[PDB]
Design a protein around this ligand. Sequence first.
Ligand code: SSA
Ligand code: SSA
Lengths: 143, 143
Amino acid sequence: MRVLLIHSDYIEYEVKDKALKNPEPISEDMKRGRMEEVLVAFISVEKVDEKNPEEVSLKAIEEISKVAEQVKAENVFVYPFAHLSSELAKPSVAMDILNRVYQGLKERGFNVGKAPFGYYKAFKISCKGHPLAELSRTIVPEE
Amino acid sequence: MRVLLIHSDYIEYEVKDKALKNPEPISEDMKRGRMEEVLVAFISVEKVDEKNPEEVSLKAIEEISKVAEQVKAENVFVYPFAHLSSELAKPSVAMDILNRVYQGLKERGFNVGKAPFGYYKAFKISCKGHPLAELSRTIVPEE
Ligand SMILES: Nc1ncnc2c1ncn2[C@@H]1O[C@H](COS(=O)(=O)NC(=O)[C@@H](N)CO)[C@@H](O)[C@H]1O
Ligand SMILES: Nc1ncnc2c1ncn2[C@@H]1O[C@H](COS(=O)(=O)NC(=O)[C@@H](N)CO)[C@@H](O)[C@H]1O
């Protein structure tokens, strides 16, 4: 799994066209959303993660939170992102890992937001541009 | 090399403090920058690229130019971004290839923009959300 953590003044999106045959069904409220003083996490679930989803989700949860501490971010937004990896994971496994992380983040006490999986979204992001405001992580299962 | 192409409504940046002992020397102008209706290219120059510098820059120029024609982009913005790869290139080689890309992209006639190299920058971007607004390319030499 490949993560891109960007501490933003805000993140905002809008669901345009579908990018898959069967994207995550969403209710009206999810068609768009906005989060402020947030740590944005663009995540590319990779094929190797299909071996051990739990270890990879739990591992990513601990690494996202750690950084949410460092930058004193109270809100974390999970952004399903397909362009951080070449070897992407099967759509079904991606959604699953992303939910695991989303949920596991919610139970850590963070206000968590999320962009709907499987769609093309337009979006605005404002990176704070500080020393630790931009990080990248790799979370892969152990053999 | 790794490239993240965001066809955005706009791209804005603002220089903070040096993220390197020896960053690209800039003038009062280079401190802030705004560009609209542009294809933002977040480029991570990799170690592998050190090998053949002129080769990489060429395929890169070509790939970005082609994507710009598809999306009818007239303005291209090259953004030095060191988070799309774990095997980054030495700061001197990374900076050269970036300038070859910047330069050879202007030769094509595009209106090109650039974010100073070696600085922590706060930035704002607005992805369009079209099928071709978010793209990724892995351009690597063949020794
Ligand atoms: N492995 C993944 N990790 C994160 N998101 C994914 C993943 N696979 C699919 N998605 C979701 O589905 C969207 C499109 O996925 S995609 O793999 O890029 N789709 C394709 O390559 C082709 N359908 C052409 O668009 C991603 O932007 C994301 O919203
Ligand atoms: N390989 C690279 N590709 C693109 N930009 C780079 C690269 N190396 C350095 N830079 C430029 O210099 C900035 C900092 O680079 S860096 O790789 O993160 N530096 C380091 O890892 C250590 N020197 C500590 O700062 C990047 O944000 C970018 O502006």
